[PDB]
Amino acid sequence: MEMEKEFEQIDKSGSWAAIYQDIRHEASDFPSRVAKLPKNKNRNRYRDVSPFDHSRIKLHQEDNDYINASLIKMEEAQRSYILTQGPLPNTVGHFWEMVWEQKSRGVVMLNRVMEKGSLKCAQYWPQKEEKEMIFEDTNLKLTLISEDIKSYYTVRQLELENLTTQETREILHFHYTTWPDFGVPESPASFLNFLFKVRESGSLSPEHGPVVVHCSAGIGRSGTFCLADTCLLLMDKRKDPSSVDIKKVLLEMRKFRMGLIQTADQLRFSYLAVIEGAKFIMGD
Numbered sequence: 001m002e003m004e005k006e007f008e009q010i011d012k013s014g015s016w017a018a019i020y021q022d023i024r025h026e027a028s029d030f031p032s033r034v035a036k037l038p039k040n041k042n043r044n045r046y047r048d049v050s051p052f053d054h055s056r057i058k059l060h061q062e063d064n065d066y067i068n069a070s071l072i073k074m075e076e077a078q079r080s081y082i083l084t085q086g087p088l089p090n091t092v093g094h095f096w097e098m099v100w101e102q103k104s105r106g107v108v109m110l111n112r113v114m115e116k117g118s119l120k121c122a123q124y125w126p127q128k129e130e131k132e133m134i135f136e137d138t139n140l141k142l143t144l145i146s147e148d149i150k151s152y153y154t155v156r157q158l159e160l161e162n163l164t165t166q167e168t169r170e171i172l173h174f175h176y177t178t179w180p181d182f183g184v185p186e187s188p189a190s191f192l193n194f195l196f197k198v199r200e201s202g203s204l205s206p207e208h209g210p211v212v213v214h215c216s217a218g219i220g221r222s223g224t225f226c227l228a229d230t231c232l233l234l235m236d237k238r239k240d241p242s243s244v245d246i247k248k249v250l251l252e253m254r255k256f257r258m259g260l261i262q263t264a265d266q267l268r269f270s271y272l273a274v275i276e277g278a279k280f281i282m283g284d
């Protein structure tokens, strides 16, 4: 069924909440024993959003290797992603340790530090060039190199130093600053423009570690980014582009982290984004 035809029949019958509950019913359910140990209690932003044990990202430390982050591997597509929660006050050093240890090139942030009059994350990168940050706990220095503020997003160059060794690496911060407080955007055009800006940078390419992607909980907004990116990749890759089924790709991705796409509005938007993206993909 050409994805767009399925979109029209679902939209006309008014059945997005219905379809979404079905995906939630067939989703995998694996154990997250480590996320729940008493010691890890202040490392989780939300009581009901946890990394599955089989796919969790482990820190290289002997003390406590735990972070709320999952490795998502889409095999046929040849693309991996790290999905994580917005850092907390006491996990900002762990966040930057993960970026270093996994060799990531880019970080994608899809929330504002404050939304709905509350804090969704910590201010985990420097606001100014001359005022760097040290994370004592993980032996790291982070420096703002450059900022490029656009209408729908901001792009930043950061330098990360492991003070243990004196090695430095350049990290790219892609910040989508315009998701509305409520709901999803009206047109996917600015979100697709943003996705392609991340792609262009090399941040999603196989010669780097996996990209790190986060929103507040790391499952909603994040899930949409990854779902859209994987579905366009497979359309470009397969012999039959129309054999790409969004529902199947989602369920495959939910094998690695719980709860990816949190509302039927967000599922509906992910179809829109892929559909509009296929005009590019397909020679246009």
Ligand SMILES: Cc1cc(C(F)(F)F)c(C#N)c(=O)[nH]1
Binding pocket: 074, 075, 076, 077, 234, 248, 249, 250, 252, 253
């Ligand atoms: C079973 C399965 C499904 C998918 C799906 F396409 F759906 F995402 C991929 C990918 N990529 C895979 O490697 N195995």
